[PDB]
């Protein structure tokens, strides 16, 4: 398991953001309330199962090439936005709009995500 998280696209630092613990600063937009409330709504707990569920989903979201809705490239690198459907243990559902960087070695780096319920 804890290696599933290690081979994922979600860095360990990003799991604080996903559970509403990435407190804001000049380079970080504070979305702690929104993300914490959504994870509770979806039934994703801040435990090992919760991390593995998200890790697997955002990793799997990079494997389909037909869910890319926006691309952007500048002098720093190449980035993309992906839509992905997620139903959680509570049975409530959302669509995650996730942003990745497309690395030079081809892998995908999870940057952020927003749930869009409606």
């Amino acid at each position: 398991t804890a290696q599933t998280i290690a081979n994922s696209v979600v860095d360990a630092k990003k799991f604080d953001y996903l559970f509403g613990k990435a407190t804001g600063n000049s380079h970080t937009l504070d979305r702690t309330n929104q993300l914490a409330l959504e994870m509770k709504r979806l039934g994703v707990a801040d435990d090992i199962n919760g991390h593995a569920v998200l890790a697997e989903h955002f990793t799997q979201a990079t494997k389909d090439s037909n869910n890319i809705v926006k691309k952007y490239t500048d002098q720093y690198g190449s980035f993309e936005i992906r839509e992905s459907f997620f139903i959680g243990p509570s049975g409530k559902a959302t669509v995650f709009e996730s942003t990745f960087e497309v690395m030079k070695d081809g892998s995908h780096r999870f940057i952020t995500t927003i749930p869009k319920n409606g």
Partner: protein, 115 residues
């Protein structure tokens, strides 16, 4: 969401009369700072790849105003007879949000949210 229309790095250099204080590679985000001579300062930051703008106002290094705007796809530097200002507009079906930030001749922020 990507900020696809932003002032060029030179335009921001003129506006803030300084390079960015710091750059974050993870989310292509920049922090700029401006001060007046009375202890009032303003921190303006934005992330090109996550699509947001933030500003914090400090009086004597105490934070008095903080605003954060999500879903920015563009912002611009505009001019009227009073001077230059950063302008950002977020338009949705029900709501229109605007912000207007001046630092010269004075630090002055004007924002609104209409249905």
């Amino acid at each position: 969401m990507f900020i696809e229309n932003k002032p060029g790095e030179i335009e921001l250099l003129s506006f803030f009369e300084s390079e960015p204080v710091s750059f974050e590679r993870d989310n292509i985000s920049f922090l700029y700072t401006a001060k007046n001579k009375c202890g009032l300062s303003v921190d303006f930051s934005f992330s090109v790849v996550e699509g947001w703008i933030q500003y914090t106002v400090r009086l004597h290094e105490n934070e008095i105003l903080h605003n954060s705007i999500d879903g920015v796809s563009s912002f611009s530097i505009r001019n009227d007879n009073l001077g230059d200002y950063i302008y950002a507009e977020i338009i949705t079906k029900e709501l229109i949000n605007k912000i207007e930030i001046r630092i010269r001749p004075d630090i002055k922020i004007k924002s609104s949210s209409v249905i």
